Write a protein that binds this ligand. Structure first.
Ligand SMILES: Cc1nc(N)nc2c1/C(=N/O)C[C@@H](c1ccc(F)cc1-c1cccnc1)C2
Ligand SMILES: Cc1nc(N)nc2c1/C(=N/O)C[C@@H](c1ccc(F)cc1-c1cccnc1)C2
Lengths: 206, 206
């Protein structure tokens, strides 16, 4: 069974802004998802210091970058905290509502799309380069879920191969955005923007 | 009763680095503590979406900046998550160990003290401007604690006036660092470095 949800209207407006505004510096999408990955890894690490059994779902704390020219996907994998169904359906949308409002105001006031992360809604920069985003996620208290959206105001969730714990963000790239499947291009961006992440980052080859 | 603890040796080395290195751009200390404050506020906000009774200790989510020329202190107050005794004594030191190691390597490799926050140990930039730091903190599962250090390799904790929930970082400033008690100076730094924090920041007057 696949369940369909409407984004909060502010988030839909944000996604449309990201998709429709002329903004050539699209490469910052990768910095934002890696930083989301690091934050999630920080969280599970901290929680494990009081409840060590929280690492029973996997001890390695890392980030994989996986390009696939056949599928036209760039996948960012982490072994971080993951997201619950409540995260996916209620909680993250509640928080993204205010971040979106603050980012929107900042943009009218002369801020720049690259500053999206300062407002805690940098996941949505995924839509700079991707026509569809698929998110596979597994949290300790919960099942593995598959979340998906091509924007248009809605997303789907189904129970989801098994990943132990963590998040996989699958970017189905736009046809004119395939430079992001290229090794020297990804390497360049990681070096420029993600040089000091405190977890190992592996760029897979094809 | 006052309990005395030794810092992990890496953290002591970090504090000494911050205190001893010639580095004129000391104003970044304020950006780091405000950002710590925002992160703590983000955390209690998120936790409240699944357990609303976590806001029984205070609903307001804000940051106060309080200068006092008589005491020679700058105090940064938040109503964020607070810290437990385990945080103060075991947990934060365990995490700061790796951040310190990574920051140290980065500095040898040509990084700059201002980048301290990318390594998750930006609290310690407090020692750029302060001879002593006192931290009053209250977390929901725990008592109110007073943490204190003038560096030198040790810190104290005692049970601590009652603050409901949150953290107060009290900077006892160095004699040559009193510009940070001045209104137009603090305003300047907040504008330059903290312009987009998603919680209200009130600069108290004297
Ligand atoms: C746990 C986690 N891991 C990774 N890699 N990325 C994110 C998380 C999250 N944990 O709460 C939040 C998630 C997020 C942040 C801000 C935001 F505005 C949206 C999301 C998000 C992402 C996917 C599906 N639905 C919402 C971004
Ligand atoms: C909850 C909280 N609030 C505020 N304002 N600041 C901090 C927190 C924290 N929550 O875990 C961690 C704290 C911190 C981070 C990194 C770090 F390396 C040290 C500390 C810290 C601070 C005071 C006493 N002992 C340790 C910085």
């Amino acid at each position: 069974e696949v369940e369909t949800f409407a984004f909060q209207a502010e988030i839909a407006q944000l996604m449309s802004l990201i998709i429709n505004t002329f903004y050539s510096n699209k490469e910052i999408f990768l910095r934002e998802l890696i930083s989301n990955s690091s934050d999630a890894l920080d969280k599970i690490r901290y929680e494990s210091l009081t409840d060590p059994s929280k690492l029973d779902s996997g001890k390695e704390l890392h980030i994989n970058l996986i390009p696939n020219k056949q599928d036209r996907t760039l996948t960012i994998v982490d072994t971080g905290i993951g997201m619950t169904k409540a995260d996916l359906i209620n909680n993250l949308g509640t928080i993204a509502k205010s971040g979106t409002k603050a980012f929107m105001e900042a943009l009218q006031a002369g801020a720049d799309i690259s500053m999206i992360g300062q407002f805690g809604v940098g996941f949505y920069s995924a839509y700079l380069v991707a026509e569809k985003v698929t998110v596979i996620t597994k949290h300790n208290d919960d099942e593995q879920y598959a979340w998906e959206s091509s924007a248009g105001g809605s997303f789907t969730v189904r129970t989801d191969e098994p990943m132990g714990r963590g998040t996989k963000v699958i970017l189905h790239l736009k046809e004119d955005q395939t430079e992001y499947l290229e090794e020297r291009r990804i390497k360049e961006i990681v070096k420029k923007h993600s040089q000091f992440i405190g977890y190992p980052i592996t760029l897979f080859v094809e």
